[PDB]
Amino acid sequence: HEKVTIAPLVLLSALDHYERTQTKENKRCVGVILGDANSSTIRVTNSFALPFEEDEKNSDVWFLDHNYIENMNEMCKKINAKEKLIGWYHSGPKLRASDLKINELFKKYTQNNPLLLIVDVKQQGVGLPTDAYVAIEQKTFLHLPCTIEAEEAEEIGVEHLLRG
Amino acid sequence: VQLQESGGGLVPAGGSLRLSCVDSGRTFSSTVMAWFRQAPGKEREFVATIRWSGGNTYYADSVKGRFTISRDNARNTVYLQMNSLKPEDTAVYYCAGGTYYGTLSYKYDFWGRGTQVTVSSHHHH
Amino acid sequence: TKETVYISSIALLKMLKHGRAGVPMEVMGLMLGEFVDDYTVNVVDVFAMPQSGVSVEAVDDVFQAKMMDMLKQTGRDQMVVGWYHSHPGFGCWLSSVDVNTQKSFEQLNSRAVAVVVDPIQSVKGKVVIDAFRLIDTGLLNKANIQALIHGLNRHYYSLNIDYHKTAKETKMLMNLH
Ligand SMILES: [Zn+2]
């Protein structure tokens, strides 16, 4: 079956993005996730933030900078060639009405059915602070199983951050 | 709510005020406290910061020589002594706590609701 | 009080992940944050430089401006407070090249710091990392005198390193574990 593996760095980056943009009560931040979709378990290992604005009173109006995806992605490739653009993240707390439309735009940057990760940056919660979704026709979002994985180097990092 | 500022209100240009902030310390640890201020239509702006132990302080450029941050450890209180006040100093003032010694507001862990400081544009001390 | 470099969660993890990716090549990147006290350097974020060894020549001025420009659009507007580099398997120390590279960072800002990570030694279960600056021009502390002398010997000294996490990062960290 379909599983998602998420690196810790990804969830800390979305939280740092949300907080550094002073993201308002009720509002959200959005960015891109990178990794490896070429297997039955999709591995998410990196992310970058996007400039995104939407209209609080009007869910069908929103702006996503297309030039910024291409320009950032081209810089990520210069660092890690095997880290592909595979989907997107937003801070939630729940799926929005515009999410399927936004997801459509991301099809043009991925080579997989885009993965949407909703990251809980409100901590209002007992365990894993991200839910993963994929769009399917069966159009609607299918919730996916997801777990934590990062290479040995990051796992020692995390333990050092708690123990310190 | 864990922090609670007081002092503050209306004062003429050239005047003085002492802000205080008490920490109940029933949810959050902090080794650092700071003041920030937010003027209508402006970003929250770093004013001063202090470490509970040692009591090393650091100040925003626009406030050096006029404002003093200090702390009463045993009483869990931070103070901002504000001298030579100018109209531009007008704002809601916020005390903030956390582990980060510096000027970024989103590195702080918890906030008071704020106390309003208004420095008259017209009346002088 | 010792001078201390405070490293954020994401800065540490991005340095570990980049350095481990680059093995066996040395990698490098820049550090973003702020200088505070005389005794405080905050490292909030980092980003990788593309591979080209590690020297001033590896610092890609156009890559860096474009990265800083884009970061600034997404609410990250801290100055550069220094640079980091891995050396896979050698300790944390500066070679003569690193010192020159650091000299150049210092010219721009006298307070710049050089962070060195060993990502291979880190998988023993302990993070091996240190920070350095160059040293230019009755009661004492014996150990600090001993360090000012070994520092003088090799032209640079080490700073203390601490990790900063916010209360919300801590909560998130504990669910990632
Ligand atoms: Zn080196």
Side-chain angles (χ1 to χ4, degrees), chain A residues 1-2 4-24 27-55 57-81 83-136 140-162 164, chain B residues 1-112 114-125, chain C residues 1-56 58-135 138-177:
Chain A
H1 326 254
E2 210 96 343
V4 192
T5 256
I6 291 84
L9 164 74
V10 179
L11 306 198
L12 299 138
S13 287
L15 173 65
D16 174 89
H17 169 207
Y18 180 86
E19 284 300 306
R20 80 203 192 204
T21 56
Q22 293 292 337
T23 311
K24 232 136 119 62
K27 292 211 128 185
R28 63 173 162 167
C29 67
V30 171
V32 178
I33 52 179
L34 306 161
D36 182 338
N38 96 328
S39 254
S40 27
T41 67
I42 309 168
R43 304 175 65 270
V44 179
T45 58
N46 211 356
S47 66
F48 60 83
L50 282 178
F52 167 87
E53 301 183 51
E54 74 195 333
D55 191 325
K57 297 269 176 307
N58 211 318
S59 56
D60 54 25
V61 173
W62 48 267
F63 295 97
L64 199 68
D65 181 357
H66 311 293
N67 278 195
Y68 190 110
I69 296 160
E70 323 185 325
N71 287 325
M72 188 62 70
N73 179 66
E74 203 265 345
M75 290 197 284
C76 291
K77 297 199 203 174
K78 296 224 179 210
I79 304 313
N80 190 344
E83 228 166 32
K84 260 79 165 149
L85 202 159
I86 62 173
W88 60 300
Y89 75 83
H90 72 79
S91 63
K94 254 152 281 176
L95 279 170
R96 310 301 186 78
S98 68
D99 288 352
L100 286 154
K101 300 194 216 190
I102 294 162
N103 198 53
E104 279 294 279
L105 298 198
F106 273 108
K107 304 199 165 176
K108 300 171 204 174
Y109 301 96
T110 61
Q111 306 183 145
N112 49 272
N113 193 16
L115 186 61
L116 169 59
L117 233 52
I118 293 192
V119 191
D120 169 43
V121 299
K122 324 198 168 171
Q123 253 80 217
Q124 295 206 300
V126 272
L128 221 111
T130 194
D131 294 304
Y133 295 94
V134 80
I136 191 60
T140 176
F141 282 112
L142 174 37
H143 183 250
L144 286 188
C146 84
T147 130
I148 323 122
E149 178 92 37
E151 232 167 313
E152 203 72 45
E154 297 164 288
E155 185 181 330
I156 305 136
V158 161
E159 302 185 356
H160 211 88
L161 286 173
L162 299 166
Chain B
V1 207
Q2 202 179 309
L3 299 173
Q4 254 233 66
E5 311 88 351
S6 130
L10 180 65
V11 141
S16 265
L17 277 175
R18 200 192 67 178
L19 303 185
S20 85
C21 177
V22 184
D23 177 7
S24 320
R26 18 62 103 102
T27 342
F28 290 99
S29 214
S30 63
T31 60
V32 169
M33 304 277 291
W35 295 86
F36 281 79
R37 76 197 172 170
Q38 188 164 226
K42 280 194 176 149
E43 296 198 24
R44 224 169 261 214
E45 169 190 53
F46 173 70
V47 180
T49 185
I50 188 165
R51 296 194 185 275
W52 285 109
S53 86
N56 286 339
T57 55
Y58 174 87
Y59 295 98
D61 300 339
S62 49
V63 115
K64 295 184 182 189
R66 305 188 297 121
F67 290 20
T68 299
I69 185 164
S70 75
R71 90 271 176 246
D72 193 322
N73 251 276
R75 286 151 200 103
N76 302 142
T77 300
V78 191
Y79 299 98
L80 186 66
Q81 179 57 44
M82 301 190 281
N83 290 325
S84 289
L85 280 170
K86 312 171 145 139
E88 39 267 71
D89 289 311
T90 292
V92 180
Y93 277 73
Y94 289 95
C95 48
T99 47
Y100 180 82
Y101 190 61
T103 70
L104 301 176
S105 63
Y106 66 88
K107 291 292 179 178
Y108 287 73
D109 296 356
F110 50 94
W111 296 79
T115 189
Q116 177 77 247
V117 170
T118 302
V119 190
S120 190
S121 270
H122 185 273
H123 303 272
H124 302 110
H125 159 93
Chain C
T1 322
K2 309 216 115 81
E3 195 169 11
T4 306
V5 182
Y6 294 94
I7 297 175
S8 84
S9 295
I10 59 172
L12 170 60
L13 289 188
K14 290 186 190 168
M15 293 187 215
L16 293 161
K17 138 173 181 70
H18 187 213
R20 172 75 186 88
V23 165
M25 295 313 286
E26 293 167 28
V27 306
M28 59 146 303
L30 299 183
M31 300 200 293
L32 305 175
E34 62 182 336
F35 301 120
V36 189
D37 252 3
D38 272 66
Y39 320 122
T40 303
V41 183
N42 285 315
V43 176
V44 171
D45 223 343
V46 308
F47 57 84
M49 282 299 104
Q51 289 280 92
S52 43
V54 158
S55 67
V56 290
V59 176
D60 190 334
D61 181 54
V62 277
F63 188 96
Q64 168 229 44
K66 174 173 187 116
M67 189 62 62
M68 215 86 81
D69 192 29
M70 294 183 75
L71 279 178
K72 185 147 177 314
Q73 301 163 47
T74 60
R76 169 75 71 229
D77 183 17
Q78 286 60 68
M79 71 174 310
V80 175
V81 296
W83 61 294
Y84 64 88
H85 83 280
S86 71
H87 41 225
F90 322 122
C92 299
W93 55 282
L94 311 171
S95 64
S96 48
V97 180
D98 305 331
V99 155
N100 293 337
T101 293
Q102 175 70 0
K103 278 188 178 148
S104 162
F105 277 92
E106 190 157 42
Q107 285 297 304
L108 294 197
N109 203 307
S110 65
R111 282 200 57 182
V113 179
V115 171
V116 176
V117 194
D118 188 336
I120 283 180
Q121 204 162 339
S122 289
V123 309
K124 268 190 203 275
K126 177 170 145 197
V127 172
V128 182
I129 174 143
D130 228 313
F132 303 107
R133 284 184 175 174
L134 313 175
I135 18 189
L139 182 97
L140 306 166
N141 179 246
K142 197 185 163 180
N144 301 339
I145 283 35
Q146 262 171 336
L148 291 158
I149 267 58
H150 281 241
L152 288 180
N153 215 39
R154 57 182 161 261
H155 306 261
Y156 67 96
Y157 60 107
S158 323
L159 281 75
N160 285 7
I161 288 209
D162 213 347
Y163 296 103
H164 170 257
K165 45 179 187 69
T166 63
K168 290 172 169 125
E169 293 180 310
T170 298
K171 283 212 250 279
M172 207 191 63
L173 285 161
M174 281 174 186
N175 291 290
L176 295 165
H177 177 74

